Swiss-Prot record:
Component of some HBO1 complex composed of KAT7/HBO1, MEAF6, ING4 and BRD1/BRPF2. Component of the MOZ/MORF complex composed at least of ING5, KAT6A, KAT6B, MEAF6 and one of BRPF1, BRD1/BRPF2 and BRPF3. Interacts (via PHD-type zinc finger domain) with unmodified histone H3. Interacts (via PWWP domain) with dimethylated and trimethylated 'Lys-79' on histone H3. The chain holds residues 555 to 674 of 1058 of the full protein. It is found in: Nucleus; Chromosome. It comes from the Eukaryota. It comes from Homo sapiens (Human). The lineage of its organism: Eukaryota, Metazoa, Chordata, Craniata, Vertebrata. Disulfide bonds: none annotated. There is a cross-link at residue 41 (Glycyl lysine isopeptide (Lys-Gly) (interchain with G-Cter in SUMO2)). Scaffold subunit of various histone acetyltransferase (HAT) complexes, such as the MOZ/MORF and HBO1 complexes, that acts as a regulator of hematopoiesis. Plays a key role in HBO1 complex by directing KAT7/HBO1 specificity towards histone H3 'Lys-14' acetylation (H3K14ac), thereby promoting erythroid differentiation. Residues 9-113 form the Bromo domain. This is Bromodomain-containing protein 1. Coiled coil: none annotated.
Amino acid sequence: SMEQVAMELRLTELTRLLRSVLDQLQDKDPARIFAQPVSLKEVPDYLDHIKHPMDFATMRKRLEAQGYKNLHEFEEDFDLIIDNCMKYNARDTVFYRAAVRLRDQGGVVLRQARREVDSIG
């Protein structure tokens, strides 16, 4: 049907917006602390601490498979990146502080994205 292809046109254009947003988020992480999953070889206890790991490459795989149905789902994954790091790493660490900074700077990007998703539809 044609309406399935308009919705697919909706999902497709959400994906185009979300890719730009992801690239802008991933620019606020020049250290690449959040680029890949935490290594279970290097942190073998990680899953005892963090139940739902996330990272930018994992978000990107999902985006490219048109796996984000709305902005809420995408924000949930970006919030896992931040939140997992602030739980696993102590307040006085380079990791924790990188997450705070990503959260702060990301908020600006996400605030305008929410306006574009509502505005464009």
